Design a protein around this ligand. Structure first.
Ligand SMILES: O=C(O)CCC(=O)C(=O)O
Ligand SMILES: O=C(O)CCC(=O)C(=O)O
Ligand SMILES: O=C(O)CCC(=O)C(=O)O
Ligand SMILES: O=C(O)CCC(=O)C(=O)O
Ligand SMILES: [Fe+3]
Ligand SMILES: [Fe+3]
Ligand SMILES: [Fe+3]
Ligand SMILES: [Fe+3]
Lengths: 275, 275, 275, 275
């Protein structure tokens, strides 16, 4: 059956209702949804009181999962990450990032389930790498197309906040590596900016002051409201996004209330650039 | 009768339904609403198919109106400003500003009516001057409390875009003047940042490079998502805000579709700072 | 006879003694000097108690002169500009600029004569556009090579500081125009950065935030000490420079003492870029 | 006998001749010199073909010496540091720093001896913390007076450039610590800026974006030419400076030529602020 899809902007975002998440999706609906997650870069679904297991299953429909090397997992589902924030574990996601770009093959998508929410706050926003690229002048597209930038797990997971033995672990297992500044989408083939303030440390193909100037420019550029969507969470909301051409930011303005979110993280392939 | 008020965040924003705008508000509802516009800094109401006259009336319940010296007005209601954007008149409000801070006595509030909308886009966001102030470190509050900054109608209404005779008019009638960087709310008495990128040119109480550094800092600070609310417009939506402790930004991402918004602008008193 | 030429750095600057400025230079010495002004971008000569007339003559050996539309001239020599600074006329040259880049055909050189000096201070420095270009990464050279930037006499000669009738004059006679960001030297053929904070307002071939980011980068880059020379003035010192591949800055740290400098300004041809 | 002292600017720098460094200084000359190093913040002496031992002796006249935990020392004089730069050891001092501010009690002075020089280049400049402070607007002086900033040996001696065992050594022995942003001179009692890009990581008494904005401002401010002096080195030149109210920068523009400089480093007391 036809899914109802309501775009939330000209670029990024859409809201859908057609699924009973509780129930496996009919091949047919899965490819309406799959295609919606690509056309819009994020999609929101409401009233989906799923379990971790059921969430992991739906993620798998997209591809193999990735296990976070730091974050805690659900009960007996190590593929679904638990984000339980509160005073004893303050939220660290109020910063524009793309998930896990510190691995060779950063995730193609993730599925967020709103399990337990505070009165208000906790909004999460997404910014389009496609729309930001399209917003660059040609000479800037030509400048950035082909540069490579270093991503460092350590920039968003510093030593001092950690255990220190299990942190070192994840470090030696995740050294800084390079991804293209401008990423060509493996499916749509659309060009998109692919740096993120959370993990991108420097554009290695220019001088240091040069990199510094380009990144300050870029870490502000992706911040333009036109490039975004903002979601006001509600319990059992589901969020699904294309992590290869977006960044997102999760507001830290609800403490000391508690907030619980489950995430399924889907492995992607190796980001590249083509002309 | 009790108005239903739903907060959209811990700081700024709320949505209300209780009014039949078509109809004058009962003293009682007007002061629930009035108080809502103060507690939250912006409030949104839906399904309010009012006319310009009816909008002007509701504005008057708040205070005397101000007439814009540039923008066109409605039919036979010069107090309600018309914003009809499209290819022949591209939108100029995609920039964080506070309305009319280029006058001695910048408006205390405005009422926006969504008359004609495009498929999507056109979102308008608001940022809290109160929340941004509270987010500054003490030494920064002490640094900014007491400084004065110059506001220049010309910064957001440059000559080249204009008529040139009626532009000069509005210029000689609106010279650059000073307002406090930190404004004390005339009613709540709450402290709030009061510079805006649209009209603030320089903090006159420091050196030039100093002002420049503080403003770059401030024009980015107020941009923090936690300080904001974002509204996805729908026809006959009404927006009402406290223009003395907020800024707002209206997305330019709908051309060549047309978009029509009516505004009532309410005169405020003279901004001040107190400790 | 052979001129003694002492380089003051690997890039920019040199000091020479061989001339009796009082006396016209022998074709032969003029082309040692001419070539020195090109190899080094600035050259300094000491103990040259020349007159305005004698200075104008030497300038002419380089080419036609240009008359400044604002600055006062010498006695009966309108080609030599007088810079008499003091409390009643505070110095405005403490800012990195290239002289008269607000005309189509900005000067190829200038000759500065130190007529009357204060106890200390008043140092003037020069920065190499060649060395700064060579310091850019390749992708940056490729980005900047071919862009054009607007120069505006008004940016360094604002209305408020002025007469207002003779200022308007010079404005209508000198509208903003474009020069290449990277200039190819008409003689050496060397590539050099060619923006200057004094007159460059925006790089017109990119977006506004983009231009803004590149110029902030560039207005700081040319500031790197390696790219420069600093001259501690002495009475009857002569300074001669290649204004097409340098910028300079004159310290404002001698008031209320008086300081008098004479300048001859030599017209250049039209700046271009080639590969 | 009276030393000849020639100021090189209104603020910072002076050149002196009166000493036969080879020979111990007469109490009387030492206090002319001592006082010159304080009035001017740096002093330069030429034609002083001293040995390391003789240099260490002169340093001692100022106070106890400090031994660098990284840099190599002279023959049998561990108090005098050797800076032998060339292709196999490229220069790392082309960056504005104050020496050893990563210890509780950063040096009050240092004495630099130019042992072996390249054809040109290698200029070293000094910037006045006093003049930079005096250049801040009052509200900025009030903002910065009393803040504290963290200094980190690691910022200018990163792991990757190192041995790694002797580097760790110097790290565990030199953890990040705090100094006042505005330092009161222990003798003159003059107020001076006391952050340096080489070691200052963050102003701990404000927010992170705030610190970041103040430091970007400060790391550029101290760069104003008026605040400085630039020395063109000559063999057997001696440089002596007050490391508690200055920063300096040593040009990296002479490779592959070799350059040898000896330094004596004098321990200071604990920096403080007073009003
Ligand atoms: O907590 C949220 O709303 C999103 C957190 C986040 O960035 C993530 O799960 O990747
Ligand atoms: O058009 C909008 O959505 C708001 C425009 C604006 O800034 C205003 O009416 O003040
Ligand atoms: O006064 C000086 O030392 C130089 C002033 C200047 O910029 C000029 O004459 O072009
Ligand atoms: O090598 C120089 O000229 C100075 C190097 C430096 O910063 C130092 O010795 O402290
Ligand atoms: Fe995330
Ligand atoms: Fe507005
Ligand atoms: Fe000049
Ligand atoms: Fe040093």
């Amino acid at each position: 059956e036809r899914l109802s899809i309501t775009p939330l902007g000209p670029y990024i975002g859409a809201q859908i209702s057609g699924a009973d998440l509780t129930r496996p999706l009919s091949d047919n609906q899965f490819e309406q949804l799959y295609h919606a997650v690509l056309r819009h870069q994020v999609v929101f679904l409401r009233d989906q009181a799923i379990t971790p297991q059921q969430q992991r299953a739906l993620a798998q429909r997209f591809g193999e999962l990735h296990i976070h090397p730091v974050y805690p997992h659900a009960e007996g589902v190590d593929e679904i990450i638990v984000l339980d924030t509160h005073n004893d574990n303050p939220p660290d996601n109020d910063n524009w990032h793309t998930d896990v770009t510190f691995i060779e093959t950063p995730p193609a998508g993730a599925i967020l389930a709103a399990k337990e929410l505070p009165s208000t706050g906790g909004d999460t926003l997404w910014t389009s790498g496609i729309a930001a690229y399209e917003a660059l002048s040609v000479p800037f597209r030509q400048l950035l197309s082909g540069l490579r930038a270093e991503h460092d797990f350590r920039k968003s997971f510093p030593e001092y906040k950690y255990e220190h033995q299990r942190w070192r672990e994840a470090v030696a297992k995740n050294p800084p590596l390079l991804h293209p500044v401008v990423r060509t989408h493996p499916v749509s083939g659309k060009q998109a900016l692919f740096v993120n303030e959370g993990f991108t440390t420097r554009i290695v193909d220019v001088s240091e002051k040069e990199s510094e100037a380009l990144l300050s420019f870029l870490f502000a550029h992706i911040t333009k409201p036109e490039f975004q969507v903002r979601w006001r969470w509600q319990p059992n909301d589901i969020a699904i996004w294309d992590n290869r051409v977006t960044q997102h930011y999760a507001n830290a303005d609800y403490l000391p209330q508690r907030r619980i979110m489950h995430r399924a993280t889907i492995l992607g392939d190796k980001p590249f650039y083509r002309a």
